[PDB]
């Protein structure tokens with residue numbers, strides 16, 4: 001019953017249905033094992049551990065998989081990679097991320113912080129031990145984190161160094177905000193997302209107050225990104241295979257804290273993407289026919305605070321994204337690998 005921080009090679013578990021053609025099911029059928037049918041965590045009594053979500057290998061462990069997963073599934077007609085043009089087959093596929101678990105091999109375990117207000121760094125008091133993590137959907141997105149877990153109590157602000165403006169801030173919402181995005185049946189690339197103005201605005205209000213506590217009640221200001229390539233300037237995600245690019249100016253720019261209706265963001269489905277796995281562009285074919293719809297829960301926000309504001313009374317925050325390791329860090333933050 002003693003251990004030390006260490007890294008090893010993990011394996012995955014998921015409930016992939018062997019028959020299903022959906023790319024995540026297929027990727028998990030041949031690369032992951034069946035989920036533990038008999039899990040049991042082991043509370044360690046009055047044991048206090050330290051965690052660090054910004055420096056956790058599990059996150060790089062998951063990243064590598066999703067990159068492998070996307071490489072063998074979601075695959076472009078043409079891939080441009082620093083002066084190369086590999087052409088390929090690019091058939092429309094079935095895409096809907098499932099949860100995947102991360103388990104340790106014999107000789108190690110994962111420590112799971114259960115402080116409902118854990119921020120991801122430092123000390124944790126109620127510490128549990130698990131063999132595998134819970135089911136995590138590997139949802140790829142910028143600006144908004146969708147379909148994830150929620151914070152159990154207060155909205156949590158996660159960062160490696162709040163004081164360093166270069167380090168990303170992950171907001172962990174305690175209440176989700178539904179976001180419905182549709183590309184109507186037959187511009188075929190035109191689409192949009194609908195969001196409750198009231199709900200979203202109340203949540204953003206609350207978020208503002210949280211950041212207030214972390215930044216000496218200094219005026220909090222939200223704005224959209226200042227410069228970017230579209231993947232970052234817009235809220236980007238994949239819905240049923242298609243890459244959606246939505247303009248979130250109406251969430252971070254009306255402030256509005258008579259505005260309380262249904263926010264409607266304009267989006268566009270882009271065949272040509274700047275990849276997240278590695279630098280390069282990938283070009284897909286045009287969209288599939290019929291209404292393409294994905295309703296998702298917004299569960300977190302990726303923010304970047306402005307710099308050089310030290311001499312003012314304001315703090316400016318803009319939605320960020322691009323590095324997916326932060327998206328995985330969004331769910332894995334409470335886990336840590338220790339060798340027995």
Ligand SMILES: CN1CCN(C(=O)N2C[C@H](CN)C[C@H](C(=O)Nc3ccc(Cl)c(F)c3)C2)CC1
Pocket residue numbers: 140141142229230231232236237238243273274275276277278279280321322323324
């Ligand atoms: C650093 N590391 C290595 C290479 N990367 C880049 O160069 N990126 C820059 C690029 C614009 N310049 C945006 C990229 C991005 O996020 N693409 C993206 C694609 C599809 C979806 Cl669905 C999505 F949500 C996002 C991030 C990845 C990060």
Ligand SMILES: *[C@@H]1O[C@H](CO)[C@@H](O)[C@H](O)[C@H]1NC(C)=O
Pocket residue numbers: 043114126128
């Ligand atoms: C510690 O977390 C575990 C996980 O559910 C649970 O027993 C309870 O929330 C906490 N226990 C105590 C004694 O606080």
Ligand SMILES: *[C@@H]1O[C@H](CO)[C@@H](O)[C@H](O)[C@H]1NC(C)=O
Pocket residue numbers: 153154155174175206207210
């Ligand atoms: C969410 O957390 C905030 C604190 O940031 C709190 O005021 C609010 O009541 C919480 N709401 C829910 C639904 O948990």
Ligand SMILES: *[C@@H]1O[C@H](CO)[C@@H](O)[C@H](O)[C@H]1NC(C)=O
Pocket residue numbers: 119120121122123157158159160161162
């Ligand atoms: C996280 O919590 C620890 C301990 O309470 C604290 O030292 C650290 O500053 C916190 N980080 C943030 C971003 O709140």
Ligand SMILES: *[C@@H]1O[C@H](CO)[C@@H](O)[C@H](O)[C@H]1NC(C)=O
Pocket residue numbers: 161163164165
């Ligand atoms: C946090 O950022 C500030 C500003 O760059 C820096 O001076 C400080 O050393 C950072 N904290 C740590 C622990 O490095």
Ligand SMILES: *[C@@H]1O[C@H](CO)[C@@H](O)[C@H](O)[C@H]1NC(C)=O
Pocket residue numbers: 180181182194293295
């Ligand atoms: C989502 O949007 C479409 C089109 O506006 C609508 O038909 C549907 O009822 C909305 N809600 C859900 C849960 O799909």
Ligand SMILES: *[C@@H]1O[C@H](CO)[C@@H](O)[C@H](O)[C@H]1NC(C)=O
Pocket residue numbers: 196197198199202262
């Ligand atoms: C938006 O959510 C609020 C609760 O915050 C609710 O009163 C209202 O019915 C919702 N709006 C719509 C159009 O469903």
Ligand SMILES: *[C@@H]1O[C@H](CO)[C@@H](O)[C@H](O)[C@H]1NC(C)=O
Pocket residue numbers: 213216217
């Ligand atoms: C922020 O303002 C609130 C006012 O409700 C006050 O109670 C609190 O002490 C202030 N905190 C800081 C860090 O300025």
Ligand SMILES: *[C@@H]1O[C@H](CO)[C@@H](O)[C@H](O)[C@H]1NC(C)=O
Pocket residue numbers: 233234247248249250
């Ligand atoms: C998003 O829409 C607003 C208008 O609502 C526009 O000013 C802005 O340029 C758009 N964003 C981008 C990156 O084009």
Ligand SMILES: *[C@@H]1O[C@H](CO)[C@@H](O)[C@H](O)[C@H]1NC(C)=O
Pocket residue numbers: 224249253254
């Ligand atoms: C929103 O901010 C953007 C700056 O990127 C700009 O289009 C616009 O002036 C702002 N909104 C309003 C209502 O002025």
Ligand SMILES: *[C@@H]1O[C@H](CO)[C@@H](O)[C@H](O)[C@H]1NC(C)=O
Pocket residue numbers: 096097139146147237238239240294295296297
């Ligand atoms: C979120 O989950 C819903 C229900 O499982 C799904 O229909 C939707 O496609 C998911 N969103 C994304 C972006 O994958």
Ligand SMILES: *[C@@H]1O[C@H](CO)[C@@H](O)[C@H](O)[C@H]1NC(C)=O
Pocket residue numbers: 147148175176296297
């Ligand atoms: C969206 O949120 C509701 C309530 O927070 C939850 O019951 C539901 O499972 C969430 N959807 C997904 C796809 O996780």
Ligand SMILES: *[C@@H]1O[C@H](CO)[C@@H](O)[C@H](O)[C@H]1NC(C)=O
Pocket residue numbers: 163308310
């Ligand atoms: C802004 O303030 C932080 C901490 O107060 C400091 O670490 C950082 O270097 C400052 N930035 C500039 C440009 O002075």
